[PDB]
Amino acid sequence: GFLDGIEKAQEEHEKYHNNWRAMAEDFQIPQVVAKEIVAQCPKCQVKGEAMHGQVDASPKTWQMDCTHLEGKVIIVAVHVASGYIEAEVLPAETGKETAHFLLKLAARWPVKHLHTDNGDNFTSSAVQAVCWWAQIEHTFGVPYNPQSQGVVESMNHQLKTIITQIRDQAEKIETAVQMAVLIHNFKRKGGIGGYSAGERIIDIIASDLQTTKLQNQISKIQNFRVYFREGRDQQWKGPATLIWKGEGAVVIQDGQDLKVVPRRKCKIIK
């Protein structure tokens, strides 16, 4: 048997910190017991679970960051769904200039959600006042995790490579920054639709507005209520709006929630 082997394996791990394969082969205990002996140790457990998340890419979300180049401060904002860039040179990295940059951006484009890191200029009362007046939701990343703002750091890299490409055609750094913004937005193609970034932001915002107006006109003349049967218990839920009926399943709306129910579990009522 292996019960005395389990006691010996606990003493051996307390001294040497074996892994589970070493203990399961030396003391001939099963692998579940050796995995438990390692999992109940605090000096071990130094390793994460090896995955990546995905960031928010809604059609009115912007990310923002500050970078440095030749002793200057550049501030970059990116539209996430298209890749569209605005960038400027600041005299200092204070909160007043960041609030002025954000107010000009909100005066030019529709901004509803802003994502930043925890820098001192972004966690500021001036930026908070501008977000209150212009009705922007500001979210911050997990501290010391630059992967939360992945799009704007990727665009920091692209902006610096273009600036080294066209550096000898300008005198100052501010002219070179605006020339790089023009080259990125209108002279580079490839991506989702074979577009540039300017064509893609025009397509995304225009398609958003057109599709809301179309389904307003569609939903104002509807009929055909639907009673459907779902759940773990075969119950009956209330009045649902039929949206689309397909060969195989139907699409219903219940409580502003969209559901796809097969045709056997529903009945349409005029």
Ligand X SMILES: O=C(NCc1c(F)cc(F)cc1F)c1cn2c(c(O)c1=O)C(=O)N1[C@H]3CC[C@H](C3)O[C@@H]1C2
Residue numbering of the annotated binding site for Mg(2+): 65, 117, 153
Instruction: Please give the single-letter amino acid code of residue 133.
Output: W
Does residue 146 touch ligand X according to CB under 6 A? yes
Does residue 207 touch DNA according to CB under 7 A? no
Check: CB of residue 66 under 8 Å from CB of residue 75. Answer: yes
- Binding site for Zn(2+), by residue number, is 13, 17, 41, 44
Select from 61-69, 91-99, 135-143, 258-266 the region that touches Mg ion (CB under 5 A): 61-69
Does residue 35 touch DNA according to CB under 7 A? yes
CB-side neighbour CA atoms (13 Å) of 67: 16
Rg of the chain over CA atoms, in angstroms? 29
The residue ranges that bind Zn ion (CB under 5 A) are: 17, 41, 43-44
* Phi (first) and psi of residue 210, to 5 degrees: -65, -35
Does residue 91 touch its own copies according to CB under 8 A? no
Check: CB of residue 115 under 8 Å from CB of residue 56. Answer: yes
Residue span 37-66 as binding mask against DNA, x where in contact by CB under 7 A, dash where not: -------xx-xxxxxxxxxxx--------x
Comparing CA positions, the residue from 217, 215, 218, 196 lying closest to residue 207 is 215
231-270: which residues touch DNA (CB under 7 A)? 234, 243-244, 246-249, 251, 258, 260, 262, 264, 267-270
Least Cβ distance, residue 221 to its own copies (angstroms): 5
Does residue 127 touch ligand X according to CB under 6 A? no
138-197: which residues touch its own copies (CB under 8 A)? 142-145, 147-148, 169, 174-175, 178-179, 181-182, 185-186, 192
Structure tokens at 92: 């200092």
Angle 176-178-179 (CA atoms, 0-180°, nearest 5)? 65
For the chain, strand residue ranges (E) read 61-69, 72-79, 84-90, 113-116, 137-140, 225-228, 240-245, 249-254, 257-262, 266-269
Least Cβ distance, residue 199 to ligand X (angstroms): 27
**Please, which residue, 171 or 220, has the CB nearer to DNA?**
220
CB-side neighbour CA atoms (13 Å) of 51: 3
Which residues, in sequence order, are bridge partners of residue 115?
63, 139
As a whole number of angstroms, the distance between CA 220 and CA 20 comes to 65
Cα 97 to Cα 130, 173, 176, distances in angstroms:
12, 18, 20
Does residue 220 touch DNA according to CB under 7 A? no
Residue span 21-50 as binding mask against its own copies, x where in contact by CB under 8 A, dash where not: ----x--xxx-xx--xx-xx-x--xxxxxx
Q: Which residues bind Cl ion (CB under 5 A)?
A: 117-118, 143
Q: Which residues bind ligand X (CB under 6 A)?
A: 65, 117-119, 146-147, 153
Q: Which residues bind Mg ion (CB under 5 A)?
A: 65, 117, 153
